[PDB]
Each structure stands twice: as C-alpha cells, then as structure tokens.
Design a protein around this ligand. Sequence first.
Ligand SMILES: C[C@H](c1ccccc1)[C@H](N)C(=O)O
Ligand SMILES: C[C@H](c1ccccc1)[C@H](N)C(=O)O
Ligand SMILES: [Fe+3]
Ligand SMILES: [Fe+3]
Lengths: 119, 114
Amino acid sequence: DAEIVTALPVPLAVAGHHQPAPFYLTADMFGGLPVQLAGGELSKLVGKPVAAPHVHEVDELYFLVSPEPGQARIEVHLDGVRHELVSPAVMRIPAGSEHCFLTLEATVGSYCFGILVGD
Amino acid sequence: AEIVTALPVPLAVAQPAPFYLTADMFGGLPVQLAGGELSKLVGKPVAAPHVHEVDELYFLVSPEPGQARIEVHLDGVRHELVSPAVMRIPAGSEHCFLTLEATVGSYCFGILVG
Ligand SMILES: C[C@H](c1ccccc1)[C@H](N)C(=O)O
Ligand SMILES: C[C@H](c1ccccc1)[C@H](N)C(=O)O
Ligand SMILES: [Fe+3]
Ligand SMILES: [Fe+3]
C-alpha cells in the first residue's frame, strides 16, 4: 500500500565526481520529486574531496549537520572563493557557479547533503 | 554567498520541530525539511498521529546501514523500517513514527514536498 524505498543509496554519476554519488532522493521517485538529495556521513572523508570543481544548471544546497553543533566543518570553494561552513549550516550554490567542497572536520554522524533544486 | 547558520528553526507542526530548510529560504524552496538526531529519541515511549496538507517523506539514515530503526504508523498499519529508508506519507494520511533503535548520528528527516 505505502510507497517505501530501501534500495538505497542510489549511485548516480555527477559532474566532476570521482565516484558515483550516493542519492537518497531522486527526481523520479514517488511519481516525481522537485529535489534530488545526495550525500553521506563525513567521518571518513576528512581531507579527501569527492569531486573536482563542477557546475550544474540547477541550484544546489549544501546541508551540513552533526549530532552536536560544531562537530563538522567543510570548506566550500565557490567561483574561486573559499567559505568555511560549521554545522549546522545551509549554503545555496546558484546554478552555473563553479563549486566543490573539502571536509575539514567531521565526527561519526556528521553529514553533508547536496540538494539539487529542480527549477 | 548565501549561507544560513541560525539553525535549526523551531516551527510548530501538527513542541516546535527543528527545521533546517524552510519554504521561504533563498527566495523560496519547494520543500521543507525538519528532523534531528534519533539517539535521544529512543527513550520516549509515545508519538502523536497527525496530518499534513502536503506529502511528507521520512528519510531515515545512520552512519552505517542498519544502525537505526523506526516504526511508522500509517493509517493504522505499523511499518518497521531499517536505515537507510525513505517512506512517502501522502497528504491527508494520519501518521507518525517512533524510534526503536539508533546509534549516535542516526537521523530521521521529515521532508514536506510542495
Ligand atoms: C550532489 C553532490 C554531492 C553533495 C554532497 C555529497 C556528495 C555529493 C554535489 N554535486 C557536490 O559534491 O557538490
Ligand atoms: C516535522 C515532523 C518531524 C519529522 C521527522 C523528524 C522530526 C520531526 C513530522 N511532522 C513528523 O513527526 O511526522
Ligand atoms: Fe555540486
Ligand atoms: Fe509529519
């Protein structure tokens, strides 16, 4: 009766990303969604970027969260300017902006989610 | 740069729930997103059924797969979900969830879909 998805994450290729990105919401789920949502736990990603700088033609939000504030930190490169985000934080990356992030600090249970907004 | 750090945003929903994305952020968003860490939600024994006028997605995650577990009550049917899991609650459906098990760093996010 209910619509449940547990074949997760869905690996999808994203521009500049070395490996497929783990998606938990995709545009085709449930008859159609206005967002896609990818990302994961950061504790094993400190110092290791998941992508080269890249551009989308949709807006992307970085959602950085951790069990306690301040336990996670990423550096977002935005058109050659570096911004440090401290959990909890939400950053909007406008479509067409060159961008990527580097994990600076993360405990177990720190996440960064990328949310592609459908336009 | 557009960065929001005054988070979570306490909003009343059917206590205030902690929101990390609200509909008015960044000139308007097609979703709202609430939720929080589940390790401190294992202990309370009850949850209240409620209804929204939009679809809500439950998004259940944990640092390692299988480390978090909830019961989703949907119109009198009990569903036991294990992380990672996403469940769609159609608008108008009476629903709630109860946390059965969670390691530190497990989350359930409620995503209201416009
Ligand atoms: C969606 C994708 C992503 C976000 C967070 C974690 C993994 C992958 C994004 N394009 C990016 O890395 O900026
Ligand atoms: C917004 C609220 C919530 C969802 C997930 C996590 C915390 C709070 C939701 N209405 C529900 O509990 O179903
Ligand atoms: Fe991106
Ligand atoms: Fe709800």
